[PDB]
Amino acid sequence: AYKLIKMAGGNSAIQTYAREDKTTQTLSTQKTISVLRNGSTSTRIIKVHINSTAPVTINTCDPTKCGPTVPMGVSFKSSMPEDADPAEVLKAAKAALALFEANLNSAFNKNVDEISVA
Amino acid sequence: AYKLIKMAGGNSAIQTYAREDKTTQTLSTQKTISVLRNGSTSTRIIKVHINSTAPVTINTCDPTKCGPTVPMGVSFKSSMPEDADPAEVLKAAKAALALFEANLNSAFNKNVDEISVA
Amino acid sequence: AYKLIKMAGGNSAIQTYAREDKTTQTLSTQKTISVLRNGSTSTRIIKVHINSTAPVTINTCDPTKCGPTVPMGVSFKSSMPEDADPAEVLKAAKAALALFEANLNSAFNKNVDEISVA
Amino acid sequence: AYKLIKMAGGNSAIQTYAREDKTTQTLSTQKTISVLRNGSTSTRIIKVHINSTAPVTINTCDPTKCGPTVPMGVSFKSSMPEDADPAEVLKAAKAALALFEANLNSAFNKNVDEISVA
Amino acid sequence: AYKLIKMAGGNSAIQTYAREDKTTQTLSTQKTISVLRNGSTSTRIIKVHINSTAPVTINTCDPTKCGPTVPMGVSFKSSMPEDADPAEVLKAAKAALALFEANLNSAFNKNVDEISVA
Amino acid sequence: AYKLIKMAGGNSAIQTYAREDKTTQTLSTQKTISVLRNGSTSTRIIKVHINSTAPVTINTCDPTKCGPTVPMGVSFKSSMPEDADPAEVLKAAKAALALFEANLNSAFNKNVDEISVA
């Protein structure tokens, strides 16, 4: 139960947030608009990028003597024509993620031959 | 209410599925392992990549839904050293996605100053 | 009966908005400052530029409204040295626009010999 | 409460007017027709240009000893396919202008994140 | 009593404001973050910069009564590592400012053997 | 409550003080005068600089528990022509400082659309 407050940042397109408790855990959201034209017609391509990271100490069996840290991260990206419906690709993506997020650190990729979407 | 069946493709430690009824909607899951060495210590880095896309007919002039197709896609990526705990990173990422999910196609950026979690 | 929301673009001291319901209709406002030096004296010149455009499907043969799109646009520009009074210039410009507004798309020029103001 | 009478001018496409009281304040309206053809089809592009200017003396704090003058100007331009409807781009442009015309000389561009159109 | 309205700036790191009555009187706020890497531990260093200026005109007698304009400004700067306590340096700075504030425009300075802090 | 005792400085333009309790916490006051020659009239420009710092130690875990020391500081600067009125730029700067003061050590910043001045 915490909240991520917006950080001072240089870019206007990117919003950066840090966790109130641990200002080492951060999150970043960015939106990009692109233009793709066929002949005379032109359509907008909206791209979203959300990145949540925190540092994690490399050495589990060490005495935690400020061992060099590696970023641990979870990222989300979205690219779609304006006013398209991501509802179904999101449902599918979330269903797939549910199979992995238990084993997101365990180097074990189960052979799944079909994924059921709710 | 549907299932993504593994497509008749060569498994490359990358598993690609297509939706049973709409085979235009696809989804791919891969896990890879890297080795990060800092001095004497070496640690394994688990990297998951899930992608869920469908083609979208460009909003066009015709009453019939006919036009060039642009891919729309939602992508989730995850990189962390082995046996780390991404629980809080995932929680924050999911809260942010909950905020931006309706606006994934909006072309307007909502300026929020804090993101409440858990 | 609608509002122009500022689009998710990088502010360049130029503000670009799109219409909320019809995001094809856009509008841009910029203000710039110049310095005009005549001999010893230097004065600041304020320059405003407002642009309001929408795409227009070319009048075509099909019953469906499908054809190449040409931009239609109305643009207002204003340049004056700082603290000047453009009240009367604006008044005359507005009277002229009132005369020509119905004929902005006419391909016929109305020959008027005087323009009444205020 | 004045009127702009037509001036003697050389061009037939451009109508030039001067204010009766001050023949130093002037106004000019021009209409141009262009042709844009796709394949066999061809369409007219009607362009209107209205320019209202007056000279203004540079030096505010001077004794008004015929200081060199700079033109202060307000301009309007219109470009659209024949028989298109500028009604909405005009409404938007006028709404935007209303925010600037108070501060048309004051070098201050307020950050506006949305413009409401009547 | 007045309000500092936010001006439209291209840079998102700096927020600029102008007084509603006098748009010549302005104020800028900027926060920036620096990383100080000591060994394998990086610490965050927060710098704040507030500036409040307005143009003052130096009247000099002249056949043509226009004199130059030079800004008068009050600036505040701050720099400290994250989660440090500025309470006491603020109190001391404010007491010194209290001594000098009356005489900011006066070119007088007297030896002060001690400054009493609240 | 404490007293800033005057330290013994070689330069007479700058007066330096140290807190009686902590001689590590210091404060400097300096006033300087500049001449701005416009034609045959020279005008006096008063600049004030107050600085209040103290050393803060960044604790980093290490086999040998000694971390580096970096200063935390609050700075005030002022510059204006003689006999000008800073009252309003001071009020505005103080209101902005009032907003940012709590968050001087926090690395958080939220968009503020206006600052209300007393």
N to C succession of SSEs of chain A: EEEEEHE
Strand content of chain A: over 45%
Strand order of the largest sheet of chain A: 1-2-3-4-5
Number of helices of chain A: 1
Biggest sheet overview of chain A: 5 strands, antiparallel
Structural class of chain A comes to mainly beta
Q: Which chains share the greatest interface?
A: C-D, 79 and 76 residues
Q: How many DSSP-defined strands of chain A?
A: 6
Principal-axes shape call of chain A: flat
Architecture overview:
The structure is cut from a larger assembly and holds six copies of chain A (118 residues). In chain A, strands 1-2-3-4-5 form a five-stranded antiparallel β-sheet, with no helix packed on it. Chain A contains one helix and six strands, in the order E-E-E-E-E-H-E. In chain A, a hairpin with a 6-residue loop joins strand 2 (14-19) and strand 3. Helices cover 12% and strands 49% of the residues of chain A. Chain A has one helix spanning 87-100; strands spanning 2-6, 14-19, 26-38, 41-57, 69-81, 114-117. The first copy, chain A, is mainly beta and 118 residues long. Chains in contact: A-B, A-C, A-E, A-F, B-C, C-D, C-E, D-E, E-F. Chain A binds chain C through residues 12-13, 31, 33, 39-42, 44, 82, and chain C through 7-11, 23, 67-70.
